[PDB]
Amino acid sequence: VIHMPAAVAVTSPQADSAPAQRFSLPQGCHFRTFWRDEANGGSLFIPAGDALRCGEDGWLQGSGAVTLQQGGQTLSPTLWFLQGYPLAQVNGGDRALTVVSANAQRLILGGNPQAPGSFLLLTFEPQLHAWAFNGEAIVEMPRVDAADETKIKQRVQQAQTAWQPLLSAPLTFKLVEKLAADRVDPASGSYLSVNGATHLEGSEFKLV
Amino acid sequence: MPAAVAVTSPQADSAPAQRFSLPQGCHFRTFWRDEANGGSLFIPAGDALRCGEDGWLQGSGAVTLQQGGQTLSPTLWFLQGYPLAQVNGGDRALTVVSANAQRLILGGNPQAPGSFLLLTFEPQLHAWAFNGEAIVEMPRVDAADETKIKQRVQQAQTAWQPLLSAPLTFKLVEKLAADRVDPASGSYLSVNGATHLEGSEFKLV
Amino acid sequence: MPAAVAVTSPQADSAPAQRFSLPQGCHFRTFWRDEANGGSLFIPAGDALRCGEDGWLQGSGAVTLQQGGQTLSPTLWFLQGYPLAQVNGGDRALTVVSANAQRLILGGNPQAPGSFLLLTFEPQLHAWAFNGEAIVEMPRVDAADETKIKQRVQQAQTAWQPLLSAPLTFKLVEKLAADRVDPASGSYLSVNGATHLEGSEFKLV
Amino acid sequence: MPAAVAVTSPQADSAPAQRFSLPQGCHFRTFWRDEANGGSLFIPAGDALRCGEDGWLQGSGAVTLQQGGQTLSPTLWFLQGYPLAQVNGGDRALTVVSANAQRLILGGNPQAPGSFLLLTFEPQLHAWAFNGEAIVEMPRVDAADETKIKQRVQQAQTAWQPLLSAPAPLTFKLVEKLAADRVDPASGSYLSVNGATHLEGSEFKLV
Amino acid sequence: AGDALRCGEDGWLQGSGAVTLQQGGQTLSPTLWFLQGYPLAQVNGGDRALTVVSANA
């Protein structure tokens, strides 16, 4: 009853090679992101405050509310800066994560010591000029090990406790033999997906 | 003390129901305005729904309705000949306070008197159906005390809920308006109850 | 002296709010004329929100509203059972001057008596929300002294800012019109406040 | 080290500008597409703009343009006979590296050599205009060091900023070699550093 | 921010400066002069004490 999950071929094309644009702050540091001008006439506002500060690495650091304004609508996401990249919906300051890949389409978050071999996937949102996390995580596990059902449960449940303290949806894990860091979908070739739940408990009112 | 509301509904259709004679002698009474419906009402044989000696259909069974190509099989409970949906109050002795083509009021819960249920006629089931509405009779003066409101409505909840199959919504009124289209007309306050959820939700990214 | 404006607003809706009964028996009160939109209101379990001995839900927590595919999670603060958004005045003993289906007036702030907050009802939230509007009661005679306008306006700002989450806008009136749709109707002057900006704007060529 | 980018822009238009002869004897030179829509360009007298001994109109004044009921009066600064909007580099000696009907490159800032400014021809002003673009010539090997990028771009800012009057911040496009003979002289840029405008004040926004 | 526009003992903002007005994604930055607190354009006579005879919308 060895039920190895069936193999899936990696079919995603190579990811955009394009380098990000620099954004120079007065105190001399950069943050790096993507901004294709679709005649947006858009504005991006970094306020002054102790939330965000220039670090000695040459990059903007910290986590604060940025104000974006395009075509009437104003958005105020709080962004966290890692290696000069603005990230939404994830904040991992006291850990020391690594950006495995960053480009105009998506960014891969790695180097969580509490569960190596797992990765977060953030998709670029041009409306925010930032990468945002939406729940998608990759778990690197050999297909041989994925026959054992308690092994699957152990790996995905390790990654879930290793990442959730940094989160602000529940997680969805795609198991793959190897991260496809060079391709548009780094999950291309995933052989199984494990979805998690959010616990509800309270009182619903629904008017007749 | 809550502020008074005047009774504004017109009074209800005068029309009597139509009788439906079963082969064993009994009748069930309901409303069927034939808009050239050409529909079917099937009362299944079997000990479930049966004739009682007062001459009315009794019990709770699945009635089969067919109209314009589709079939619905709602399980209906009969009281005094009337087809009722979403309520089965067999253990108790309930009374139909009013019944017309628009609505039926179900009273007679000894566990909470003063409390009535409102059932609305659904012409596709030829039955009246409970969807959550309840009318509790309470004096406004007593409604100044909040503890009293709570007591009265929780009495009614514990009294009616075992017989119900939406949460309950209680409209307090000074006196039931049994003669009018809305028996709650003149209601001066509404208390809505909750449904407790507890579990795991899966929503895909 | 600024010129008088006559009060032109009609009287506000007389209807009381609907009650919402929790498991421990306490109420919260708000407005919901279901537009048959099948909305959902979720009170989570936790210490943030708790029933109190007054018979009202108390505290400040995230309430989840769901409607026609929508999900919103405004975190609301409950005062005298009313759910209020964008203001949280826990420490102080504020008073609800008036509440109805259109707007709610927040009063009884001791650090700036004569000042009131105006919150407008937001039906997709089933709660009253703060958007910046404050009313200031001042005789028109004193409103000649410009220094006095500035004293009263900046008294309220310092007394209401702490309990807030837009900047403030004060509408001066001789008499709060607590019974009408626009309690500020009859206002003779408006002072709008500023938000300080300081940062670095990026704007792509 | 940043990855090389190939120069993909075509060669720029060869056409020379048209001369416009002033009474006291000097020219200014610009482009007037033969739309012959019937437009008017007025150089006022009064010594704000004057003829110089190089033979070119010089100085900074409001030039009045009139086309189809519309009157535009931009204040233009004249360098080497070319009308420039949003820039006034008087104390300095700047050079026009290239000038065509599409764009003008301004160089010669001694405080930051290697930096250039790109101005775009606006056919309604019959002049070229600064909108915020600058090109910094830097090798990619040196651009591997991040401290060097920041040095070069801040040098360029301090050197060019006082001469500007544009309603936009500065955007630097780094390239190994200026493409002065192409439509986009920044074509081949391998990195872009965008600058900010400092705001500080009171915003009013009514409910 | 700046000394161009400033508050005075009159209780009114005094000075002549650029007030950035932004709407419809269009940004207008007029240089306005303030008399009796009123924002005025194309006219600047600060060192004179002129009189506002009527101000309406």
Contact D126, D20 (CB under 8 A): no
Phi-psi region of B25 (alpha: psi -120 to 50; beta: other; left: phi over 0): left
Q: Which residues contact B56 (CB under 8 A, 6 or more apart)?
A: B26, B27, B28, B29, B78, B80, B81
CA distance A51 to C37: 42
Q: Give, as one character, the DSSP assignment of residue D45.
A: -
Q: What is the DSSP string of D74-114?
A: -EEEEETTEEEESB---SS--EEEEE-SSEEEEE--TTSTT
CA distance A59 to A82: 8
CA neighbor of A60 nearest in space, from A88, A43, A81: A81
How far away is chain C from the Cα of A36, in angstroms, using its nearest Cα? 9
Residue pointed to by tokens 């129901």? B17
Burial letters for D142-177: b for 16+ Cβ neighbours within 10 Å, e otherwise?
ebeeeeebbebbbbbbebbeebbebebbbbbbbbbe
Contact A131, A46 (CB under 8 A): no
Radius of gyration of chain B (CA): 19
Nearest chain D residue to E28, by CA:
D167
CA neighbor of C163 nearest in space, from C104, C200, C101, C117: C117
Q: Which residues contact C80 (CB under 8 A, 6 or more apart)?
A: C54, C56, C96
CA distance B194 to A23: 52
CA distance D58 to D28: 8
Q: Which residues contact A208 (CB under 8 A, 6 or more apart)?
A: B131, B132, B133, B166, B169, C34
Three-state secondary structure along D140-183? CCCCCCHHHHHHHHHHHHHHHHHHECCCCCCEEEEECCCCCCEC
Contact C129, C119 (CB under 8 A): yes
Residue from C146, C147, C195 to probe the interface with E (highest E Cβ count within 10 Å): C146
User: Could you tell me which residues are beta bridge partners of residue C174?
Assistant: none
CA distance C12 to C15: 9
D12 CB neighbour count, 10 Å cutoff: 19
Q: Which residues contact B121 (CB under 8 A, 6 or more apart)?
A: B31, B100, B101, B102, B103, B104, B127, B128, B129
How far away is chain A from the Cα of E44, in angstroms, using its nearest Cα? 32
CA distance A6 to A190: 10
C-alpha D60: how far from chain center: 15
How far away is chain C from the Cα of E46, in angstroms, using its nearest Cα? 22
Residue pointed to by tokens 């419809």? E24
Give contacts of C147 with chain E, Cβ < 8 Å. Answer: 11
CA distance D179 to D187: 7
H or E element: which one contains A201? strand A198-205
Cα–Cα distances in angstroms (integers) from residue B124 to residues B23, B35, B61, B69, in the given order: 24, 12, 17, 13
How far away is chain C from the Cα of E11, in angstroms, using its nearest Cα? 7
C110 and B CB contact within 8 Å: no
Q: Is A159 helix (H, G, I), strand (E, B) or coil?
A: helix
One-letter amino acid of B119: L
CA distance A129 to A134: 16
CA distance D68 to C139: 57
Chain breaks in chain A (C to N over 2.5 A) after: 168
Q: Which of residues 1-60 of A touch D (CB under 8 A)?
A: 17, 19, 21-26, 28, 30, 45-46, 58
Q: Encoding tokens for residue B115?
A: 């409390």
D70 CB neighbour count, 10 Å cutoff: 9
B202 CB neighbour count, 10 Å cutoff: 10
Q: Encoding tokens for residue C126?
A: 């089933």
Q: Which residues contact C91 (CB under 8 A, 6 or more apart)?
A: none
Q: Encoding tokens for residue A201?
A: 């408990």
Q: Which of residues 129-148 of A touch B (CB under 8 A)?
A: 134-136
CA distance C88 to C130: 10
CA neighbor of A203 nearest in space, from C50, B115, D89: C50
CA distance A47 to A31: 14
Contact D154, D160 (CB under 8 A): no
Give contacts of A43 with chain E, Cβ < 8 Å. Answer: none
Contact D121, D101 (CB under 8 A): yes
Resolution number, Å: 2.9
Cα–Cα distances in angstroms (integers) from residue E50 to residues E43, E44, E46, E54, in the given order: 11, 10, 9, 12
Q: How many helices (H) and strands (E) does chain B have?
A: 1, 16
Q: Are strands A118-125 and A130-140 parallel, antiparallel or unpaired?
A: antiparallel
Give contacts of C146 with chain E, Cβ < 8 Å. Answer: 11
H or E element: which one contains A125? strand A118-125
CA neighbor of B110 nearest in space, from B94, B99, B87, B88: B94
Are B196 and A203 in contact (CB < 8 Å)? yes
Contact A137, A190 (CB under 8 A): no
Q: Terminus-to-terminus CA distance in chain E, angstroms?
A: 27
Q: Is C79 helix (H, G, I), strand (E, B) or coil?
A: strand
Residue from D86, D202, D206 to probe the interface with E (highest E Cβ count within 10 Å): D202
Give contacts of C190 with chain D, Cβ < 8 Å. Answer: none
Residue pointed to by tokens 């504005």? A43
Q: Which residues contact C174 (CB under 8 A, 6 or more apart)?
A: C4, C137, C138, C139, C140, C186, C188
Instruction: Provide the residue count of chain A.
Output: 208
Angle at C196 between CA C192 and CA C197, to 5 degrees: 130
CA distance E11 to E5: 13
User: Could you tell me which residues are beta bridge partners of residue B84?
Assistant: B77, B128
How far away is chain D from the Cα of C95, in angstroms, using its nearest Cα? 24
D150 and A CB contact within 8 Å: yes
| Chains D+B touching (3+ CB pairs under 8 Å) | no
**Structure determined by:** X-ray
> Where do the DSSP E strands lie in D4-74?
18-21, 27-30, 40-42, 49-51, 57-62, 64-67, 70-72
CA distance B190 to B135: 9
How far away is chain E from the Cα of A40, in angstroms, using its nearest Cα? 9
Are B150 and C27 in contact (CB < 8 Å)? yes
Q: Report the largest interatomic distance among the alpha carbons of chain E, rounded to a whole angstrom.
A: 37
Contact B33, B123 (CB under 8 A): yes
Nearest CB neighbour to B196, from listed C14, C23, C55: C23
How far away is chain B from the Cα of A202, in angstroms, using its nearest Cα? 6
Binding partners of E (≥3 Cβ pairs within 8 A)? A, C, D
CA distance A185 to A187: 5
CA distance B69 to B67: 6
CA dihedral A27, A30, A35, A41 (to 10 degrees): 0
Are A19 and D190 in contact (CB < 8 Å)? yes
Residue pointed to by tokens 């233009």? D76
H or E element: which one contains B146? helix B146-160
Residue pointed to by tokens 């790096």? A32
CA neighbor of C12 nearest in space, from C185, C169, C171, C175: C185
- Please classify residue B165 by burial: count the beta carbons closer than 10 Å to its beta carbon, then call 0-12 exposed, 13-18 middle and 19+ buried: exposed
CA neighbor of A136 nearest in space, from A165, A106, A113: A106
Contact B63, B108 (CB under 8 A): no
How far away is chain C from the Cα of B8, in angstroms, using its nearest Cα? 15
Strands in E31-35's sheet, in edge-to-edge order, are: E5-7, E13-18, E31-35, E38-41
One-letter amino acid of D83: P
Three-state secondary structure along C133-156? EEEEECCCCCCCCHHHHHHHHHHH
Contact D91, D101 (CB under 8 A): no
**Cα-Cα-Cα-Cα dihedral sign, residues D41, D45, D47, D51:** positive
CA distance B32 to A146: 62
Nearest CB neighbour to D200, from listed E1, E27, E29: E1
Are A203 and B192 in contact (CB < 8 Å)? no
User: Could you tell me which residues are beta bridge partners of residue C96?
Assistant: C106
D167 and C CB contact within 8 Å: no
Residue pointed to by tokens 């421990």? C24
Residue pointed to by tokens 């080497």? D80
Contact D130, D85 (CB under 8 A): yes
Three-state secondary structure along D180-193? CCECCCCCCCCEEE
CA distance E15 to E40: 11
Torsion angles phi and psi, residue B105, rounded to 5 = -100, 130
Are A42 and C204 in contact (CB < 8 Å)? yes
Contact C87, C119 (CB under 8 A): yes
Nearest CB neighbour to B192, from listed C16, C19, C55: C19
Give contacts of A28 with chain D, Cβ < 8 Å. Answer: 150, 154
Are A203 and C40 in contact (CB < 8 Å)? no
CA distance B46 to B63: 12
Nearest CB neighbour to B200, from listed A197, A205, A207: A197
Are D194 and C204 in contact (CB < 8 Å)? yes
Are D167 and E29 in contact (CB < 8 Å)? yes
Nearest chain A residue to E27, by CA:
A41
Q: Encoding tokens for residue D67?
A: 């086309």
Cα–Cα distances in angstroms (integers) from residue C115 to residues A79, C98, C140, in the given order: 37, 14, 15
One-letter amino acid of C184: A
Burial letters for D76-94: b for 16+ Cβ neighbours within 10 Å, e otherwise?
bbbbebbbbbbbbbeeeeb
CA distance C21 to B196: 12
What residue spans of chain C are helical by DSSP H? 146-160
**Cα-Cα-Cα-Cα dihedral sign, residues A128, A133, A136, A137:** positive
Nearest chain A residue to D146, by CA:
A58
One-letter amino acid of C55: G
CA distance B11 to A45: 64
Nearest CB neighbour to B192, from listed A198, A199, A205: A205
Q: Encoding tokens for residue A180?
A: 């496809």
C197 and D CB contact within 8 Å: yes
CA distance B71 to B55: 28
Give contacts of E25 with chain A, Cβ < 8 Å. Answer: 41, 70-72
How far away is chain C from the Cα of B131, in angstroms, using its nearest Cα? 13
Torsion angles phi and psi, residue D183, rounded to 5 = -65, -40
